[PDB]
């Protein structure tokens, strides 16, 4: 767990289409703090540390996936295959695992932010 969260996480963001967004903040995106809450809504007593351990964790095979947590899928069974496919306008949560490389997808960076950030 090398990386801290909001130390110098930058990832440059533009307001619209073509055009840098005038104020450039130094913070972690929006969709992490999202996966936190949802990850605080499953249970308490989550912390940051912990979610960095859990993240490390479950990620041995890449989909044989695991249980016991519930982001996504409002269908409790653990015989659930579908095929993942990225929808347009939304973070991204099910169909990506992470630990491997490739590009992001629909480019829906331009969103709002928090205030405690380097701006």
Not at 5 to 28: A, K
Not at 53 to 59: G, N, Y
Not at 93 to 107: A, E, I, K, R, V
């Amino acid at each position: 767990s090398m990386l801290p969260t909001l130390s110098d996480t930058y990832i440059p963001q533009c307001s619209t289409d073509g055009q840098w967004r005038q104020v450039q903040c130094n913070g972690p995106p929006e969709q992490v703090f999202e996966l936190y809450q949802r990850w605080e809504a499953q249970n308490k007593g989550q912390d940051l540390t912990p979610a960095k351990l859990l993240v490390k964790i479950m990620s041995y095979r890449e989909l044989q996936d695991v249980p016991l947590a519930a982001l996504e899928g409002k269908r409790p069974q653990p015989r659930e295959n579908i095929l993942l496919e990225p929808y347009l306008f939304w973070q991204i949560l099910n169909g990506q695992l992470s630990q491997y490389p490739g590009s992001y997808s629909d480019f829906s960076t331009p969103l709002a932010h928090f205030d405690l950030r380097n701006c």
